Design a binder for this molecule. Structure first.
Ligand SMILES: NCc1ccc(C(F)(F)F)cc1
Length: 330
């Protein structure tokens, strides 16, 4: 079996992407943020604290004939940006673009942090990292991808994110019309539970390629590209007037500047991120200072290939016995 769903940016900056998901019987459609950096399927629900809901579509397990309360199970998650949520667990039927999984753990939020309340367009998250990161206690639960795996024609999912435009998440197959040239595959380490891989280097604009190992994670749930301080400094040194600002919390640049492109290596292949993708607009309404899409990972502890990098390529997440990541130009 296969699945295919359109993913759409939530705003004009591509801060996040939402994909419609059918949960329960009869179907209750919620717009979820597909996150390859986490492993919990959690949703806003009829149980969420009323004051912490501001425009989101909620899941109502009492209206679903296939919803079962997972007796005694709880969940609690803390994200890298300081956001969090927790609650109880149900099992229900979940479908993504025609691909159906019965008995999927649907984590019902009882409490959510302000950053989720403020994002009215995001009804929850669908975790696509390895199931070892799932927070359900006392019995850990599997991700949607892990449950669909045996039914899929091929144990893969692909991410084709659009730049200021809709894109696609495919499950079970590789659309050969979605990319140009060849797909280059690279090894994945599952030791930390992420789609962790090693980039072979970088180039800034039309500069010389610098061969250097950059260990990082392919994360659809993170907006920006977080790279080592040395790399980020070399990129922003090519933008006249750019500087790191402690009040803003990162590199800012004059909104009138032209940004050079950024190239990252995948084995012997190169993925070029156009400079326009690195512009995240004014730091505040009316400001002539713009926020950069390439920031330092020194305060995070891990390098993150977020939406800025992934949207410049067709990305294959191969969940075979030995996982690999494929990258192709598009
Ligand atoms: N990396 C997971 C993640 C995704 C979205 C959000 C936000 F912005 F919606 F709160 C926080 C954390």
């Amino acid at each position: 079996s296969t699945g295919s769903a359109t993913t759409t940016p939530i705003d004009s900056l591509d801060d996040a992407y939402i994909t419609p998901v059918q949960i329960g019987t009869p179907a209750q459609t919620l717009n979820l943020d597909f996150d390859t950096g986490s492993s919990d399927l959690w949703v806003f629900s009829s149980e969420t604290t009323a004051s912490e809901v501001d425009g989101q579509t909620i899941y109502t397990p009492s209206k679903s004939t296939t919803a079962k309360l997972l007796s005694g199970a709880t969940w609690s998650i803390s994200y890298g940006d300081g956001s969090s949520s927790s609650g109880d667990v149900y099992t229900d039927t979940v479908s993504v673009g025609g691909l159906t999984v019965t008995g999927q753990a649907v984590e019902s939020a009882k409490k959510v942090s302000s950053s989720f309340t403020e994002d009215s367009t995001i009804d929850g998250l669908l975790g696509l990292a390895f199931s070892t990161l799932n927070t359900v206690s006392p019995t850990q639960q599997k991700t949607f991808f892990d449950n669909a795996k045996a039914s899929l024609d091929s144990p893969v999912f692909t991410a084709d994110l659009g730049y200021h435009a809709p894109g696609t998440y495919n499950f079970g197959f590789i659309d050969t019309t979605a990319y140009t040239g060849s797909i280059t595959y690279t090894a994945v380490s599952t030791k930390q539970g992420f789609w962790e891989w090693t980039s072979t280097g970088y180039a800034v604009g039309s500069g010389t390629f610098k061969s250097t190992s950059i260990d990082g994670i392919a994360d659809t749930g993170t907006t920006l590209l977080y790279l080592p301080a040395t790399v980020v400094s070399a990129y922003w040194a090519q933008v006249s007037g750019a500087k790191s600002s402690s009040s803003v919390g990162g590199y800012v640049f004059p909104c009138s500047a032209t940004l050079p492109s950024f190239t990252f290596g995948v084995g012997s292949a190169r993925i070029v991120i156009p400079g326009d993708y690195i512009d995240f607009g004014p730091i505040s309404t009316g400001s002539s200072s713009c926020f950069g899409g390439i920031q330092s990972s020194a305060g995070i502890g891990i390098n993150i290939f977020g939406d800025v990098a992934l949207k410049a390529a067709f990305v294959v997440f191969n969940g075979a016995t030995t996982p690999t990541l494929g990258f192709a130009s598009k």
